[PDB]
Amino acid sequence: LHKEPATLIKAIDGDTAKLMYKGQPMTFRLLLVDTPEFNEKYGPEASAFTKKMVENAKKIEVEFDKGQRTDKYGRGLAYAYADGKMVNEALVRQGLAKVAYVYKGNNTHEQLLRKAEAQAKKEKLNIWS
Ligand SMILES: Cc1cn([C@H]2C[C@H](OP(=O)(O)O)[C@@H](COP(=O)(O)O)O2)c(=O)[nH]c1=O
Ligand SMILES: [Ca+2]
Structure with missing residues (x-):
């Protein structure tokens, strides 16, 4: 996979921007x-x-996976990076998101993300508390 440039327009919620x-x-x-x-x-x-992560970033990048790049609602489906730190991973590591929606062909970072979730769960963070 490869990272491509993007710029923040507006934060929306935990998993969309x-x-x-x-x-x-x-x-x-x-x-x-x-x-x-x-x-x-x-x-x-x-x-x-x-919001803090994307707003404070000097550089935002998106990384598409090998499968669908947009969902049925016309949303882009990507891994997002803020000064090289993956937002998707960081949410899961803090217990603020679950690993979910793992569709075949767009699951390159699944195991990275499951390892973060295991760590959050051991620490009883947030959702896991
Ligand atoms: C994350 C993701 C969501 N979706 C669709 C599945 C769910 O459809 P439904 O809306 O019919 O439940 C919806 C969940 O997104 P949200 O969690 O933003 O609501 O987005 C994809 O199709 N592919 C994806 O990779
Ligand atoms: Ca959601």
């Missing part, structure tokens, strides 16, 4: 994770974690 990619606005949904919705427990905490 509006980004400019190849000069067009798009909602991105983070691959292989699920954060609580804003109205659910840990939802506000997830939203705030992702």
